[PDB]
Amino acid sequence: SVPTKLEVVAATPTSLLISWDAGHWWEWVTYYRITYGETGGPVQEFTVPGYSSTATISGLKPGVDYTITVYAPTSDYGSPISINYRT
Amino acid sequence: SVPTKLEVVAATPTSLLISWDAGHWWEWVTYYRITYGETGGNSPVQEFTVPGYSSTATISGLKPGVDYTITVYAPTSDYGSPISINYRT
Amino acid sequence: MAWLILIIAGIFEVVWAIALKYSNGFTRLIPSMITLIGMLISFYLLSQATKTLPIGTAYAIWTGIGALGAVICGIIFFKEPLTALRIVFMILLLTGIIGLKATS
Amino acid sequence: MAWLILIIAGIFEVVWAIALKYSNGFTRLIPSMITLIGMLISFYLLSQATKTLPIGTAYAIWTGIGALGAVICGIIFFKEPLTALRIVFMILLLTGIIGLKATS
Numbered sequence: 001s002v003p004t005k006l007e008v009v010a011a012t013p014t015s016l017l018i019s020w021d022a023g024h025w026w027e028w029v030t031y032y033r034i035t036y037g038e039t040g041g042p043v044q045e046f047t048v049p050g051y052s053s054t055a056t057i058s059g060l061k062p063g064v065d066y067t068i069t070v071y072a073p074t075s076d077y078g079s080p081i082s083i084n085y086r087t
Numbered sequence: 088s089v090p091t092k093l094e095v096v097a098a099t100p101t102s103l104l105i106s107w108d109a110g111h112w113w114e115w116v117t118y119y120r121i122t123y124g125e126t127g128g129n130s131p132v133q134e135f136t137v138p139g140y141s142s143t144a145t146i147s148g149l150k151p152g153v154d155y156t157i158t159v160y161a162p163t164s165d166y167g168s169p170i171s172i173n174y175r176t
Numbered sequence: 177m178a179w180l181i182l183i184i185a186g187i188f189e190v191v192w193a194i195a196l197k198y199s200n201g202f203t204r205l206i207p208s209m210i211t212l213i214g215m216l217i218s219f220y221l222l223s224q225a226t227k228t229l230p231i232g233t234a235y236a237i238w239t240g241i242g243a244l245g246a247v248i249c250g251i252i253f254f255k256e257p258l259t260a261l262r263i264v265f266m267i268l269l270l271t272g273i274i275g276l277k278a279t280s
Numbered sequence: 281m282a283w284l285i286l287i288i289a290g291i292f293e294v295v296w297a298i299a300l301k302y303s304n305g306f307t308r309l310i311p312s313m314i315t316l317i318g319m320l321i322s323f324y325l326l327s328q329a330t331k332t333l334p335i336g337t338a339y340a341i342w343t344g345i346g347a348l349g350a351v352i353c354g355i356i357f358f359k360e361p362l363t364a365l366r367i368v369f370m371i372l373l374l375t376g377i378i379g380l381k382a383t384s
C-alpha cells in the first residue's frame with residue numbers, strides 16, 4: 001500500500017531523481033528511508049521527511065546498474081518498493 | 088535583574104559578538120530576544136531570539152561605520168528591565 | 177480567562193491522546209503532527225493558566241477535562257459502554273470542576 | 281515491582297507540575313527544564329508500568345498520585361488556599377478522574 005509507484009523522474013550518468021506516491025491523508029507516514037546501491041554486491045541510505053515524495057540520489061557510478069528502495073517507517077503499511085536502474 | 092553586563096566581546100565591520108550576565112541559576116530564562124538597529128536611523132530594528140541557556144550571541148550583516156543600539160530582553164520585564172548599548176562597527 | 181484557557185487546554189489533552197493511538201509507533205504523519213501540536217498547545221496553555229491559578233487546582237481540572245472528554249469521545253466516536261458508574265463518576269467530575277470555579 | 285515504578289511515574293507527575301508553576305509560563309530556565317524532563321520520565325515509566333499493569337488501573341493511580349500530589353505541594357510551597365469547600369470539590373474532582381480511568 002505505502003509507499004508505491006517508485007520511479008526515476010530524471011537521471012544523469014551520476015544522479016537519479018526518484019519519486020513516489022505518499023498515499024493521501026491517513027497514509028502519509030512521518031518519514032521514508034531511501035537506499036541505493038549496485039544490484040550485484042555496502043549499501044548506502046538516507047531518509048526524507050514523510051511530507052516530501054521526491055528524493056535525489058547522487059554520487060553514483062555511471063554505467064553501473066543500481067537498485068533503489070524506499071521503505072516506510074514500519075512494515076505495518078504495505079511492503080517496500082524496489083526498482084533497478086542503470087545510470 | 089536580568090540580563091546584566093551587556094558588552095561587545097568581539098567586533099568586525101560587519102559583525103558584533105555580544106555577551107551578558109545571565110544571573111544566577113534561578114535567574115536564568117528560557118530565551119532572550121535581541122534587538123539591533125542603527126541608532127536614530129529611519130530603519131526598524133531587526134530581532135531574533137536566543138536560547139536562554141546562552142549568555143552570548145553574534146549579530147551579523149551590519150553596515151560598517153554605522154552606530155547600532157543592541158538590546159537584550161528577558162521573556163518578561165517582571166525580572167529586570169532590558170539592557171542596551173551603543174556600539175559603532 | 178485563565179479558566180477559559182484551561183478548558184481549551186484540557187480539550188487539547190484528549191485530542192493528542194486520541195491522535196497518539198490513531199498514529200502507529202509515532203509514524204503516521206497526520207496523526208503524529210496532531211499529537212505534537214496538541215501536546216505543545218496543551219502544555220503551553222497549561223503553563224499560562226498556572227501563572228495565575230493554583231497548580232493543584234489547575235492540574236486537577238486540566239486532567240479532569242482530558243479524562244472527561246476522553247469518555248465523551250469513547251462513548252460517541254467509539255461505541256463505548258455507558259455505565260451508571262461512569263455516569264456518576266462523570267457527575268462527580270463536573271461537580272468538582274464547577275465547584276472549584278465557584279470558589280475562586 | 282511494576283507498581284513501584286508507577287508510583288515513581290506519578291511522583292514525577294508532581295515534579296513537573298510544581299516546576300511548571302516555577303517556570304512562569306515556560307520562561308524561567310531550569311524550572312522549564314525540570315518540567316520537560318519530568319513529564320518525559322513520567323510518560324516513560326508509565327509506559328513501562330502499563331506494560332504489565334492494567335491500563336485502566338495504571339492510569340487511575342498515575343494521575344491520582346499526580347493530581348493529589350499537585351494539590352498538596354501547592355497548598356504548601358505556593359501557599360495555595362486550604363478552604364473546606366475547595367478540598368471537598370477537589371476530592372469530588374479527583375475521585376471522578378480516578379473513577380473514570382479505573383472503569384476503562
Ligand SMILES: CCCCCCCCCCO[C@@H]1O[C@H](CO)[C@@H](O[C@H]2O[C@H](CO)[C@@H](O)[C@H](O)[C@H]2O)[C@H](O)[C@H]1O
Pocket residue numbers: 117118120134136162306312
Ligand atoms: C520549552 C521552553 C523553552 C521554549 C521557549 C520558546 C520561546 C519562543 C521563542 C520566541 O518567543 C516569542 O518571540 C516573540 C518575538 O516577537 C516575543 O514577542 C515579543 O516581540 C514583540 C514584537 O516583536 C514585542 O512587541 C513584544 O514585547 C514581545 O512579546 C515573545 O517574547 C515570545 O513569545
Ligand SMILES: CCCCCCCCCCCC[N+](C)(C)[O-]
Pocket residue numbers: 109110115139140141142309313
Ligand atoms: C547540562 C546539564 C543538564 C541540565 C541543563 C541545565 C543548564 C543549562 C543552561 C546553562 C546555563 C546557561 N547560561 C547561564 C550559561 O547561559
Ligand SMILES: CCCCCCCCCCCC[N+](C)(C)[O-]
Pocket residue numbers: 260261264
Ligand atoms: C441517582 C441515583 C442512583 C445513583 C447510583 C447509580 C449507580 C448505582 C449502581 C452501581 C453498580 C456498579 N457496581 C460495580 C458498584 O456494582
